[PDB]
């Protein structure tokens, strides 16, 4: 399995990815990923149990969640893999990402409703079922609530942070994980959710298929960080209340640990990933 930059997919790969996503939606499997994510986003807290985000396991948890999702795609079409969206490079509303042949574009001004692409409510193929309000159509406001996506220089500043994570291992932490997640610093991952708007800015963000491409790029940045810092590794390493330690298993699967997910190459490779160097 090779995960490719979305900007490079062939028209045939785009078609097959779109069809596989829509089949997971049709069969009811897609909405359960939305539901799982929402449960963790609403339950993880800075002073209590935290697993899916605001915590060191933000990265391995999303790596396994994305693997779950990619395996479900591959059960429909074994040729499909998750593409990633480098939002530092493809940073405008006119990126091919947002074209009608791929994810469709931004929402109309009146109600945020996405009007084109395969996931537009008018197709009949993308009901928003797992939701926090009455609206049942995909919404987006690209670049609405925040001016700009992160730039490469900003990403590089975070990649340069050597410590994986630091006590208190939450949204107040210093270190790489929380700067990539975005609760501190120039803000990478949280700001992208805000920039897309619509359901991507909410507690039911996998309702937008761009969620997967966003997180596939966050996951690639973890792999880039590892290459930059081969002397750094996941922390904490045991005995930390409320936090998933390196060799502890993670909900909801219960059968996998951060330790089992640190080396992505056991599961997939990237189209390009820079080697360690000085």
């Amino acid at each position: 399995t090779v995960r490719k930059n979305q900007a490079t997919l062939t028209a045939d790969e785009k078609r097959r990815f779109v069809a596989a996503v829509l089949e997971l939606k049709r069969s009811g499997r897609y909405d359960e990923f939305v539901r799982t994510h929402n449960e963790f986003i609403m339950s993880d807290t800075d002073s209590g149990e935290r697993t899916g985000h605001r915590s060191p396991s933000f990265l391995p948890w999303h790596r396994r969640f994305l693997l779950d999702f990619e395996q479900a795609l591959q059960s429909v079409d074994s040729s499909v893999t998750l593409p990633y969206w480098d939002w530092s490079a493809d940073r405008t509303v006119r990126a091919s990402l947002w074209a009608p042949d791929f994810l469709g574009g931004t929402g109309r001004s009146t109600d945020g409703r996405v009007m084109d692409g395969p996931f537009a409510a008018s197709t009949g193929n993308w009901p928003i079922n797992v939701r926090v309000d009455s609206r049942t159509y995909l919404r987006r406001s690209l670049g609405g609530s925040v001016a700009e996506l992160p730039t490469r220089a900003e990403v590089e500043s975070v990649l340069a942070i050597s410590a994986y994570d630091l006590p208190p291992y939450n949204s107040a932490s210093e270190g790489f994980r929380n700067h990539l997640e975005g609760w501190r610093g120039v803000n990478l991952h949280n700001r992208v959710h805000v920039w897309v708007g619509g359901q991507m800015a909410t507690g039911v963000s996998p309702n937008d298929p761009v969620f997967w491409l966003h997180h596939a790029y966050v996951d690639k940045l973890w792999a880039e960080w590892q290459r930059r810092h081969p002397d750094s590794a996941y922390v904490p390493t045991g005995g930390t209340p409320d936090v998933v330690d390196l060799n502890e298993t993670m909900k909801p699967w219960n059968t996998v640990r951060p330790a089992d997910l640190l080396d992505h190459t056991a599961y997939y490779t990237f189209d390009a990933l820079e080697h360690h160097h000085h």
Partner: protein, 78 residues
């Protein structure tokens, strides 16, 4: 110590807050009498399930951001 309670009409909708599959929260917010899940971060900022990634300083600010996001839509219970 929890923030103070509040009650106002914001953009035509009633928003209320009070100290008290999701977390055990010390504070409740309502939009037209439907509960809005909200959460406090370590630095004292607030988020909600309709604006989870954009911290705001207070629970009233989170309720107002939710009314802004909803564009008139009824909230569904969590």
């Amino acid at each position: 110590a929890a923030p103070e309670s509040f009650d106002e009409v914001y953009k035509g909708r009633r928003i209320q807050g009070r100290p008290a599959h999701e977390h055990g929260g010390g504070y409740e917010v309502f939009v037209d009498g439907v509960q809005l899940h909200v959460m406090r971060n370590a630095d004292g900022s607030w988020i909600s399930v309709v604006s989870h990634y954009d911290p705001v300083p207070t629970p009233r600010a989170a309720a107002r951001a939710a009314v802004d996001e909803l564009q008139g839509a009824p909230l569904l219970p969590f």
